[PDB]
Scaffold this active site. Structure first.
Site, PDB file in Angstrom:
ATOM      1  N   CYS A  73       0.811  -1.219   0.000  1.00  0.00           N
ATOM      2  CA  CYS A  73       0.000   0.000   0.000  1.00  0.00           C
ATOM      3  C   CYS A  73       0.836   1.256   0.000  1.00  0.00           C
TER       4      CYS A  73
ATOM      5  N   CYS B 296      -1.726   1.795  -2.934  1.00  0.00           N
ATOM      6  CA  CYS B 296      -2.680   2.838  -2.678  1.00  0.00           C
ATOM      7  C   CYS B 296      -2.115   4.227  -2.558  1.00  0.00           C
TER       8      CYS B 296
ATOM      9  N   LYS C  89      -0.108   5.508  -6.024  1.00  0.00           N
ATOM     10  CA  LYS C  89      -1.081   5.494  -7.096  1.00  0.00           C
ATOM     11  C   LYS C  89      -2.094   6.612  -6.962  1.00  0.00           C
TER      12      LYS C  89
ATOM     13  N   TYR D 269      -9.026  -3.080 -11.822  1.00  0.00           N
ATOM     14  CA  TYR D 269      -8.898  -1.672 -11.469  1.00  0.00           C
ATOM     15  C   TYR D 269      -7.445  -1.166 -11.595  1.00  0.00           C
TER      16      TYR D 269
ATOM     17  N   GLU E 184      -6.793   2.357 -13.721  1.00  0.00           N
ATOM     18  CA  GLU E 184      -6.190   3.467 -13.027  1.00  0.00           C
ATOM     19  C   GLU E 184      -4.920   3.872 -13.703  1.00  0.00           C
TER      20      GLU E 184
ATOM     21  N   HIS F 202     -28.266  20.191  -0.759  1.00  0.00           N
ATOM     22  CA  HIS F 202     -28.287  20.656  -2.126  1.00  0.00           C
ATOM     23  C   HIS F 202     -27.409  21.880  -2.152  1.00  0.00           C
TER      24      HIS F 202
ATOM     25  N   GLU G 271     -26.964  13.935  -2.914  1.00  0.00           N
ATOM     26  CA  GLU G 271     -28.359  13.960  -2.539  1.00  0.00           C
ATOM     27  C   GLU G 271     -29.187  13.123  -3.498  1.00  0.00           C
TER      28      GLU G 271
HETATM   29  C1  LIG Z   1     -27.279  33.434  -1.943  1.00  0.00           C
HETATM   30  C2  LIG Z   1     -28.130  32.281  -1.487  1.00  0.00           C
HETATM   31  C3  LIG Z   1     -27.601  31.053  -1.513  1.00  0.00           C
HETATM   32  C4  LIG Z   1     -28.274  29.937  -0.985  1.00  0.00           C
HETATM   33  N1  LIG Z   1     -27.729  28.734  -1.100  1.00  0.00           N
HETATM   34  C5  LIG Z   1     -28.367  27.656  -0.681  1.00  0.00           C
HETATM   35  C6  LIG Z   1     -27.786  26.308  -0.916  1.00  0.00           C
HETATM   36  O1  LIG Z   1     -26.717  26.090  -1.482  1.00  0.00           O
HETATM   37  N2  LIG Z   1     -28.535  25.276  -0.449  1.00  0.00           N
HETATM   38  C7  LIG Z   1     -29.763  25.370   0.136  1.00  0.00           C
HETATM   39  O2  LIG Z   1     -30.370  24.363   0.526  1.00  0.00           O
HETATM   40  N3  LIG Z   1     -30.287  26.647   0.277  1.00  0.00           N
HETATM   41  C8  LIG Z   1     -29.657  27.751  -0.100  1.00  0.00           C
HETATM   42  N4  LIG Z   1     -30.254  28.979   0.006  1.00  0.00           N
HETATM   43  C9  LIG Z   1     -31.700  29.054   0.467  1.00  0.00           C
HETATM   44  C10 LIG Z   1     -32.801  28.583  -0.452  1.00  0.00           C
HETATM   45  O3  LIG Z   1     -32.531  29.165  -1.726  1.00  0.00           O
HETATM   46  C11 LIG Z   1     -34.200  28.868   0.019  1.00  0.00           C
HETATM   47  O4  LIG Z   1     -34.311  28.232   1.310  1.00  0.00           O
HETATM   48  C12 LIG Z   1     -35.312  28.262  -0.797  1.00  0.00           C
HETATM   49  O5  LIG Z   1     -35.288  28.661  -2.170  1.00  0.00           O
HETATM   50  C13 LIG Z   1     -36.640  28.646  -0.205  1.00  0.00           C
HETATM   51  O6  LIG Z   1     -37.752  27.938  -0.759  1.00  0.00           O
HETATM   52  P1  LIG Z   1     -39.156  28.724  -0.780  1.00  0.00           P
HETATM   53  O7  LIG Z   1     -40.039  27.735  -1.433  1.00  0.00           O
HETATM   54  O8  LIG Z   1     -39.455  29.235   0.584  1.00  0.00           O
HETATM   55  O9  LIG Z   1     -39.194  29.959  -1.772  1.00  0.00           O
HETATM   56  P2  LIG Z   1     -38.183  30.761  -2.722  1.00  0.00           P
HETATM   57  O10 LIG Z   1     -37.410  29.776  -3.509  1.00  0.00           O
HETATM   58  O11 LIG Z   1     -37.517  32.000  -2.249  1.00  0.00           O
HETATM   59  O12 LIG Z   1     -39.304  31.193  -3.793  1.00  0.00           O
HETATM   60  C14 LIG Z   1     -40.034  32.395  -3.503  1.00  0.00           C
HETATM   61  C15 LIG Z   1     -40.949  32.709  -4.652  1.00  0.00           C
HETATM   62  O13 LIG Z   1     -41.983  33.592  -4.222  1.00  0.00           O
HETATM   63  C16 LIG Z   1     -42.023  34.737  -5.090  1.00  0.00           C
HETATM   64  N5  LIG Z   1     -42.851  35.787  -4.515  1.00  0.00           N
HETATM   65  C17 LIG Z   1     -42.680  36.474  -3.352  1.00  0.00           C
HETATM   66  N6  LIG Z   1     -43.597  37.362  -3.133  1.00  0.00           N
HETATM   67  C18 LIG Z   1     -44.558  37.090  -4.097  1.00  0.00           C
HETATM   68  C19 LIG Z   1     -45.880  37.567  -4.308  1.00  0.00           C
HETATM   69  N7  LIG Z   1     -46.515  38.405  -3.455  1.00  0.00           N
HETATM   70  N8  LIG Z   1     -46.488  37.126  -5.433  1.00  0.00           N
HETATM   71  C20 LIG Z   1     -45.855  36.320  -6.275  1.00  0.00           C
HETATM   72  N9  LIG Z   1     -44.642  35.787  -6.160  1.00  0.00           N
HETATM   73  C21 LIG Z   1     -44.064  36.184  -4.998  1.00  0.00           C
HETATM   74  C22 LIG Z   1     -40.517  34.987  -5.349  1.00  0.00           C
HETATM   75  O14 LIG Z   1     -40.267  35.845  -6.478  1.00  0.00           O
HETATM   76  C23 LIG Z   1     -40.412  33.564  -5.814  1.00  0.00           C
HETATM   77  O15 LIG Z   1     -39.189  33.261  -6.442  1.00  0.00           O
HETATM   78  C24 LIG Z   1     -29.584  30.099  -0.457  1.00  0.00           C
HETATM   79  C25 LIG Z   1     -30.171  31.386  -0.565  1.00  0.00           C
HETATM   80  C26 LIG Z   1     -29.472  32.453  -0.995  1.00  0.00           C
HETATM   81  C27 LIG Z   1     -30.075  33.814  -0.895  1.00  0.00           C
HETATM   82  C1  LIG Z   2      -0.936  -0.851  -7.827  1.00  0.00           C
HETATM   83  C2  LIG Z   2      -1.805  -1.270  -6.627  1.00  0.00           C
HETATM   84  C3  LIG Z   2      -2.721  -0.415  -6.185  1.00  0.00           C
HETATM   85  C4  LIG Z   2      -3.430  -0.664  -5.009  1.00  0.00           C
HETATM   86  N1  LIG Z   2      -4.298   0.244  -4.586  1.00  0.00           N
HETATM   87  C5  LIG Z   2      -5.101  -0.041  -3.596  1.00  0.00           C
HETATM   88  C6  LIG Z   2      -5.986   1.023  -3.091  1.00  0.00           C
HETATM   89  O1  LIG Z   2      -5.987   2.182  -3.512  1.00  0.00           O
HETATM   90  N2  LIG Z   2      -6.739   0.646  -2.010  1.00  0.00           N
HETATM   91  C7  LIG Z   2      -6.669  -0.584  -1.381  1.00  0.00           C
HETATM   92  O2  LIG Z   2      -7.194  -0.750  -0.278  1.00  0.00           O
HETATM   93  N3  LIG Z   2      -5.849  -1.553  -1.930  1.00  0.00           N
HETATM   94  C8  LIG Z   2      -5.038  -1.299  -2.932  1.00  0.00           C
HETATM   95  N4  LIG Z   2      -4.120  -2.219  -3.311  1.00  0.00           N
HETATM   96  C9  LIG Z   2      -3.796  -3.409  -2.444  1.00  0.00           C
HETATM   97  C10 LIG Z   2      -3.142  -3.326  -1.116  1.00  0.00           C
HETATM   98  O3  LIG Z   2      -1.866  -2.752  -1.365  1.00  0.00           O
HETATM   99  C11 LIG Z   2      -2.981  -4.698  -0.472  1.00  0.00           C
HETATM  100  O4  LIG Z   2      -4.284  -5.237  -0.229  1.00  0.00           O
HETATM  101  C12 LIG Z   2      -2.360  -4.729   0.898  1.00  0.00           C
HETATM  102  O5  LIG Z   2      -1.174  -3.948   0.960  1.00  0.00           O
HETATM  103  C13 LIG Z   2      -1.999  -6.126   1.310  1.00  0.00           C
HETATM  104  O6  LIG Z   2      -1.693  -6.174   2.687  1.00  0.00           O
HETATM  105  P1  LIG Z   2      -0.694  -7.292   3.239  1.00  0.00           P
HETATM  106  O7  LIG Z   2      -0.676  -7.057   4.711  1.00  0.00           O
HETATM  107  O8  LIG Z   2      -1.138  -8.615   2.766  1.00  0.00           O
HETATM  108  O9  LIG Z   2       0.790  -6.974   2.833  1.00  0.00           O
HETATM  109  P2  LIG Z   2       1.518  -6.239   1.662  1.00  0.00           P
HETATM  110  O10 LIG Z   2       1.041  -4.908   2.081  1.00  0.00           O
HETATM  111  O11 LIG Z   2       1.553  -6.660   0.225  1.00  0.00           O
HETATM  112  O12 LIG Z   2       2.985  -6.337   2.361  1.00  0.00           O
HETATM  113  C14 LIG Z   2       3.761  -7.531   2.200  1.00  0.00           C
HETATM  114  C15 LIG Z   2       5.110  -7.479   2.867  1.00  0.00           C
HETATM  115  O13 LIG Z   2       5.758  -8.738   2.840  1.00  0.00           O
HETATM  116  C16 LIG Z   2       7.010  -8.646   2.189  1.00  0.00           C
HETATM  117  N5  LIG Z   2       7.724  -9.887   1.895  1.00  0.00           N
HETATM  118  C17 LIG Z   2       7.382 -10.810   0.972  1.00  0.00           C
HETATM  119  N6  LIG Z   2       7.871 -11.999   1.193  1.00  0.00           N
HETATM  120  C18 LIG Z   2       8.719 -11.813   2.278  1.00  0.00           C
HETATM  121  C19 LIG Z   2       9.633 -12.672   2.943  1.00  0.00           C
HETATM  122  N7  LIG Z   2       9.795 -13.987   2.690  1.00  0.00           N
HETATM  123  N8  LIG Z   2      10.376 -12.098   3.884  1.00  0.00           N
HETATM  124  C20 LIG Z   2      10.042 -10.881   4.314  1.00  0.00           C
HETATM  125  N9  LIG Z   2       9.161 -10.023   3.842  1.00  0.00           N
HETATM  126  C21 LIG Z   2       8.594 -10.539   2.737  1.00  0.00           C
HETATM  127  C22 LIG Z   2       6.840  -7.594   1.117  1.00  0.00           C
HETATM  128  O14 LIG Z   2       8.139  -7.021   0.948  1.00  0.00           O
HETATM  129  C23 LIG Z   2       6.241  -6.777   2.187  1.00  0.00           C
HETATM  130  O15 LIG Z   2       6.265  -5.387   2.035  1.00  0.00           O
HETATM  131  C24 LIG Z   2      -3.298  -1.932  -4.354  1.00  0.00           C
HETATM  132  C25 LIG Z   2      -2.359  -2.834  -4.848  1.00  0.00           C
HETATM  133  C26 LIG Z   2      -1.615  -2.518  -5.896  1.00  0.00           C
HETATM  134  C27 LIG Z   2      -0.477  -3.451  -6.197  1.00  0.00           C
END
Ligand SMILES: Cc1cc2nc3c(=O)[nH]c(=O)nc-3n(C[C@H](O)[C@H](O)[C@H](O)COP(=O)(O)OP(=O)(O)OC[C@H]3O[C@@H](n4cnc5c(N)ncnc54)[C@H](O)[C@H]3O)c2cc1C
Ligand SMILES: Cc1cc2nc3c(=O)[nH]c(=O)nc-3n(C[C@H](O)[C@H](O)[C@H](O)COP(=O)(O)OP(=O)(O)OC[C@H]3O[C@@H](n4cnc5c(N)ncnc54)[C@H](O)[C@H]3O)c2cc1C
Ligand SMILES: NC(=O)c1ccc[n+]([C@H]2O[C@@H](COP(=O)([O-])OP(=O)(O)OC[C@H]3O[C@@H](n4cnc5c(N)ncnc54)[C@H](OP(=O)(O)O)[C@@H]3O)[C@H](O)[C@H]2O)c1
Ligand SMILES: NC(=O)c1ccc[n+]([C@H]2O[C@@H](COP(=O)([O-])OP(=O)(O)OC[C@H]3O[C@@H](n4cnc5c(N)ncnc54)[C@H](OP(=O)(O)O)[C@@H]3O)[C@H](O)[C@H]2O)c1
Lengths: 486, 487
Positions: free
Chosen positions: A51, A56, A59, A197, A201, A460, A465
Site C-alpha cells: 500500500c 494505494c 497510485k 482496477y 487506473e 443541495h 443527494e
Molecule cells: C445566496 C443564497 C444562496 C443559498 N444557497 C443555498 C444552498 O446552497 N442550499 C440550500 O439548501 N439553500 C440555499 N439557500 C436558500 C434557499 O434558496 C431557500 O431556502 C429556498 O429557495 C426557499 O424555498 P421557498 O419555497 O421558501 O421559496 P423561494 O425559492 O424564495 O421562492 C419564492 C418565490 O416567491 C415569489 N414571490 C414572493 N412574493 C410574491 C408575491 N406576493 N407574489 C408572487 N410571487 C411572490 C418569489 O419571487 C419567488 O421566487 C440560499 C439562498 C441564498 C439567498
Molecule cells: C498498484 C496497486 C494499487 C493498489 N491500490 C489499492 C488502493 O488504492 N486501495 C486498497 O485498499 N488496496 C489497494 N491495493 C492493495 C493493497 O496494497 C494490499 O491489499 C495490501 O497492501 C496487502 O496487505 P498485506 O498485509 O497482505 O501486505 P503487503 O502490504 O503486500 O505487504 C507484504 C510485505 O511482505 C514482504 N515480503 C514478501 N515476502 C517476504 C519474505 N519472505 N520475507 C520478508 N518479507 C517478505 C513484502 O516485501 C512486504 O512489504 C493496491 C495494490 C496494488 C499493487
C-alpha cells in the site's frame, strides 16, 4: 517459553497492524521481517508494504496529478484564461514528488519501531525451518547465508501478493505496476493489459502525462472491462474513458511481444492486429506471495494458486501459525488486511475471538471519473432473493454543463431486497463517489432500508443527494428473471 | 364555480413548485401558481424556480466551482504541470455569461413543465389575499395596483420565501446584497462582505478568486468569531484557512456609515472608527420572511413579529385552509427542507397521508473554500442536554497538500456523542468533499447510529471519509455540562 512471542513475516498493512498492537497493547516481544526498509527496486515494497510503497498511496498521488489535465481544460468554461499551449505535464517532477512523499512514510515507520518496546525490525528474506523457528536469510535462494534465526511462539505470515505474468513470448519486455512507479519518462504510446482496477487506473495516469501526439490503449480479453462490477456502470465508464482519449480494446489479448530496434515493443495481438508501444504494462492479476516461505517445512497447507488456507480466525492447519492479508486471498484490500491483523491479536493475545467480516466491504476505483461501490450487484442479489428491486439515477452534474465535459454523467444505482426494502448494494460512478460510499457502507452494516435513504433530507447542491431522491424502482427481478412489473 | 381552483400557490420557488406540481400531476387537482417573473434577473431576481434556482443555491455553487480553480491551477505545479503562470487571468464577464445561460435553461424547463402538466397553470403578477377563498393577482406590490386576476380557490398555500435584510446605517443604499452580486458587470478589485454567515463567507471566496491582481477582500463581522452556531474548532480552522488564502477577516467589526467617493468607490467607516474604501460593499446579515405585501390580515392569518407566518407541524396556519412552507415560516431555511415540506403538504391534504416534516438532524454544507459538512449537535449544546458527552476529534493534512503546496489545508472531523449509549449526536467536518460525505452521514444519524457502527465499518482507502471509521477514543468529555477529561 521462547525468545519471541510473535514473529511476523512481512511488514505491510496487516503485519504492521498485528505487530504494533501485540507489542504495544499487549507487551509482547514481536520481531517483524521485511526485505527492505525504503521503497524502491529491487524489491519495490519495503516498510508499510505494497500500500505505502507501490500501491494505494503512490497510485492515488499519481491519479490526483493525472486529474489536472482535466481541470485545467475545464477552467476555460468558468472564465479562467491562460496560455493553453504552454501547458506541459512533467513525469520526472511527479515521480520525484511521489518518491519524496513515500520516503517520509518509510521514515515514519523507523520511528515506530524505534519507539515501541518489544517491536524490532529484522531485514531479510524470512522462511520457515519448522513451526517455531523462522530463518532470516540473505535472499530467497535457500542456500544463501542465514543472517539470524528466531525462536518463537506464534508465526504470522503477512507476505502479500505479486503481479501475475502472462506466459507469452516476450513477457520479459512487459512491465507490471511495480516498474510503472519508477519509469524515467512518461510513455508516448502505452498498452495496459487487463480490465481490472489497476489497469484502468494506470491508463488514466499515462493518458494525462503522455507527450502531445501520444496514445494509450487498454486491452481486455473479455467483453466489457471491470468484471464483477455493475454492468451499467461498466458500460458508462468505458464511454467516459474513450471520451478522454483512451482506446479501449475489448476481446483483445497479446500473443507475442518483440523488441524493435529503437527499444519500443512490437505487440502481435491474438487477433493478428499489431502495434508498437513504448511500454506494455501487465496488470492481469496479483497472485499470493507464498512460494518461497518453505511452508512445506512446517506442514502449512496452501491452495492451488498458492493462497495459504486459513479459517475464519486466520488459523492455518498448524495451530500456532496464522496467515492474513493478500496471501490468504480473501478480499485483497488494505483496510481488510488491517482488520484481520487487529482480530488476530485479540484472538491470540487477548482471548477475545474476533473474525473479520469480509461481506459488505466497500471499494473505490480511482479512474477518471472514479467509482464507489458496496454490496451486491443485481445479478447476484437476483439469484439469492425472489424479488429484487433496482433503482437508478443518472444526470450530468451542472458544473459540467458550463465546463464542457458534458460526457460526464454521475450515475447511482441501488439494489434492494424488494420484500423488506433492505439495501443490498449501492453502485456509483462520478467524482467524489470514493468519498460518498464510505458513509454508505456504514448504513449498509446497520441494515439500512430504501425508506431510510429517501426519508433523509438532502444537502443541495451536491451529487450525493440523488441517493435520497430515488423512490420508485426502475425494474425488478422476480425469481431470477428481469421483469419491469411484479 | 364549485370553487374554480383547488389550490392556489403564491410563490413558484422550491416548496411552491413541489407542491403545485405534485398536487396536479399526481393527484389531478387544478392548480394556479403565481410568481412575479418567468426568467431570472432584475427587477425581481427570483422567478420560476424561486430563490434557489435564480439567485441562490444553483448560481452560487457554479460561481464557487469557478472560484476553486484559482487554487487547483496553483496546486497543479506540485504535481508537475508546467504553464505560463503569468498568463493566468480570471474573467468575471465570462463567468456571469455562463452562469446566466445555465440559469435561463432551468427557467425554460419549468416553463415546459407548466406547458405539459395538465391542470397546472402559471399566473404572473403580485399575489395578495382578498379573503380566505380569493387570491388577487395584481400589477405590483402596491395595494392599490390594478388587479389583473381573481382566483377562487379552495386552498391557498403561501410559499413566498424571504429577502435580504439591510442595515439601518447612513449609506445603506450604496451597498449591494447577494441578488445584485450575481449581476455585477465587473468583479470588484477591493470588496467587503459584511455578515458572518454562510452567504457572506461564500461570497468572500468568489470575489477573492476573481479579483484583479492586487485586490483585497475583507469580511467584516460584529461577533467574536464567524459562523455562529457551528462547531467552535471548525470556525477557528476555517478562519485561519480563509486568511491563509488572502481573505482579511475583520471580527468585532461592523460598518457605521458608508459614503460615495468621487471616483465611484465607497468609503466605509467602521464603528471602530476604522475606515477604508471599496468597489463593492455587500451586506449578508440576515433574510427576512417575505410576507408583508400579501394582506394576511384580510384572511386573518397570523404572523410572528418578524413577518414569519406562524404554522403548526402540518404547516397549516390558524386559518384552516391556508398553509405556509419554505422560508416564510422561518423553520429551517434550505431548499430541501422547503421541498420536503411541500411534498408533505400535498400528502396530508390531497393524498390523505398525514406527514409532518421532521426538522431535526438536517445536514448542511457551507460551500466556502475549503467547504464544511455539518449535521446534528454542536458539543456545547449537547452538554446542556445530556450528562455525559464524549467528543472524538481528528485533523490531518491530506498528503496531497504536502505535494500541492497548500499545507494550511487541514481536513478535520469532530464527532459528538451521548457517552452513556454511544449514540452519535452530531458529525462536523471541514475540508474538501465534506458536503458529499455529510449527506450519507445524515442517513446514519436518522437511523440512530452509535459510534461502534462507525468504527466497525471497514474503511475505503485512501480517502478523507475514512477518518469517520478510525475514531475509537474520546478526546475529552462534558460531564454534567462541565468540560471534564477522564469522564
Ligand atoms: C445566496 C443564497 C444562496 C443559498 N444557497 C443555498 C444552498 O446552497 N442550499 C440550500 O439548501 N439553500 C440555499 N439557500 C436558500 C434557499 O434558496 C431557500 O431556502 C429556498 O429557495 C426557499 O424555498 P421557498 O419555497 O421558501 O421559496 P423561494 O425559492 O424564495 O421562492 C419564492 C418565490 O416567491 C415569489 N414571490 C414572493 N412574493 C410574491 C408575491 N406576493 N407574489 C408572487 N410571487 C411572490 C418569489 O419571487 C419567488 O421566487 C440560499 C439562498 C441564498 C439567498
Ligand atoms: C498498484 C496497486 C494499487 C493498489 N491500490 C489499492 C488502493 O488504492 N486501495 C486498497 O485498499 N488496496 C489497494 N491495493 C492493495 C493493497 O496494497 C494490499 O491489499 C495490501 O497492501 C496487502 O496487505 P498485506 O498485509 O497482505 O501486505 P503487503 O502490504 O503486500 O505487504 C507484504 C510485505 O511482505 C514482504 N515480503 C514478501 N515476502 C517476504 C519474505 N519472505 N520475507 C520478508 N518479507 C517478505 C513484502 O516485501 C512486504 O512489504 C493496491 C495494490 C496494488 C499493487
Ligand atoms: N476495486 C477494488 O479495489 C478491488 C476489486 C477487485 C479486486 N481487488 C484486489 O485484487 C487485486 C488484483 O487487481 P487487478 O487489478 O490486477 O484485477 P483482476 O480483476 O484479477 O485483474 C485481472 C484482469 O486481467 C484479466 N486477466 C486475468 N488473467 C488473465 C490472463 N491470464 N490473460 C489475460 N487477461 C487476464 C482479467 O480478466 P477477467 O476479469 O476476465 O479474469 C481482469 O480483467 C488487487 O490488487 C486487490 O487489491 C480490489
Ligand atoms: N450552513 C448553512 O447552510 C446554514 C446555516 C444556518 C442557517 N441557514 C439557513 O437559515 C438562514 C439564516 O442563517 P444565516 O447564517 O444567513 O443567519 P444570520 O445569523 O442572520 O446570518 C447573518 C450574519 O450576519 C450577522 N448579522 C445579523 N444581523 C446583523 C446586524 N443587524 N448587524 C450586523 N451583522 C448582523 C449575523 O451575526 P450573528 O450570528 O452574530 O447574528 C451573521 O453573522 C439562511 O437564509 C438559510 O439559508 C443555513
Amino acid at each position: 517459553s521462547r525468545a519471541y512471542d510473535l514473529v511476523v513475516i512481512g511488514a505491510g498493512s496487516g503485519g504492521l497492524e498485528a505487530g504494533w498492537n501485540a507489542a504495544s497493547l499487549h507487551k509482547k516481544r514481536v520481531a517483524v521481517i521485511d526485505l527492505q526498509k525504503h521503497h524502491g527496486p529491487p524489491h519495490y515494497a519495503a516498510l508499510g508494504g505494497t500500500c505505502v510503497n507501490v500501491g494505494c498511496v503512490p497510485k492515488k498521488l499519481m491519479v490526483t496529478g493525472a486529474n489536472y489535465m482535466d481541470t485545467i481544460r475545464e477552467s476555460a468554461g468558468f472564465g479562467w484564461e491562460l496560455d493553453r499551449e504552454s501547458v506541459r505535464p512533467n513525469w520526472k517532477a511527479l515521480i520525484a514528488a511521489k518518491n519524496k512523499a513515500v520516503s517520509g512514510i518509510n521514515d515514519s515507520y523507523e520511528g515506530m519501531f524505534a519507539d515501541t518496546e518489544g517491536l524490532t525490525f529484522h531485514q531479510g528474506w524470512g522462511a520457515l525451518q519448522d513451526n517455531h523457528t523462522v530463518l532470516v536469510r540473505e535472499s530467497a535462494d535457500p542456500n544463501s547465508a542465514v543472517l539470524e534465526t528466531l525462536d518463537t511462539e506464534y508465526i504470522l505470515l503477512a507476505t502479500g501478493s505479486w503481479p501475475q505474468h502472462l506466459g507469452i513470448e516476450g513477457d520479459d519486455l512487459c512491465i507490471t505496476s511495480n516498474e510503472a512507479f519508477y519509469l524515467d519518462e512518461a510513455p508516448k504510446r502505452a498498452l495496459c493489459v487487463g480490465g481490472g482496477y489497476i489497469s484502468i487506473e494506470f491508463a488514466g495516469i499515462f493518458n494525462a502525462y503522455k507527450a502531445r501526439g501520444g496514445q494509450v490503449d487498454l486491452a481486455y480479453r473479455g467483453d466489457m472491462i471491470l468484471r464483477g462490477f455493475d454492468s451499467e456502470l461498466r458500460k458508462q465508464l468505458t464511454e467516459q474513458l474513450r471520451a478522454n482519449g483512451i482506446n479501449v480494446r475489448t476481446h483483445e489479448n497479446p500473443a507475442k511481444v518483440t523488441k524493435n530496434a529503437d527499444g519500443t515493443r512490437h505487440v502481435v495481438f491474438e487477433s493478428g492486429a499489431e502495434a508498437d508501444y513504448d511500454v506494455v504494462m501487465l496488470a492481469i492479476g496479483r497472485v499470493p506471495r507464498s512460494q518461497t516461505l518453505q511452508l512445506d517445512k512446517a506442514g502449512v497447507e496452501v491452495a492451488k494458486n498458492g493462497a495459504i488456507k486459513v479459517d475464519a480466525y486466520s488459523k492455518t492447519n498448524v495451530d500456532n501459525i496464522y496467515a492474513i492479508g493478500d496471501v490468504t486471498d480473501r478480499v485483497m484490500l488494505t483496510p481488510v488486511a488491517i482488520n484481520e491483523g487487529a482480530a488476530f491479536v485479540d484472538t491470540v493475545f487477548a482471548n477475545k475471538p474476533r473474525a473479520t467480516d469480509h461481506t459488505k466491504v466497500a471499494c473505490a476505483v480511482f479512474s477518471i471519473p472514479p467509482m464507489g461501490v458496496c454490496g451486491y450487484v443485481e445479478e447476484d442479489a437476483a439469484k439469492k432473493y425472489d424479488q429484487v428491486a433496482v433503482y437508478e439515477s443518472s444526470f450530468t452534474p451542472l458544473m459540467h454543463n458550463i465546463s464542457g465535459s458534458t460526457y460526464k454523467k454521475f450515475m447511482v444505482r441501488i439494489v434492494t431486497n424488494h420484500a423488506d426494502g433492505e439495501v443490498l448494494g449501492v453502485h456509483m460512478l462520478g467524482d467524489s463517489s470514493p468519498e460518498i460510499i464510505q458513509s454508505v457502507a456504514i448504513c449498509l452494516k446497520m441494515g439500512a432500508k430504501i425508506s431510510d435513504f429517501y426519508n433523509t433530507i438532502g444537502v443541495h447542491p451536491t451529487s450525493a443527494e440523488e441517493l435520497c431522491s430515488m423512490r420508485t424502482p426502475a425494474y425488478f427481478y422476480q425469481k431470477g428473471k428481469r421483469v419491469e412489473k411484479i
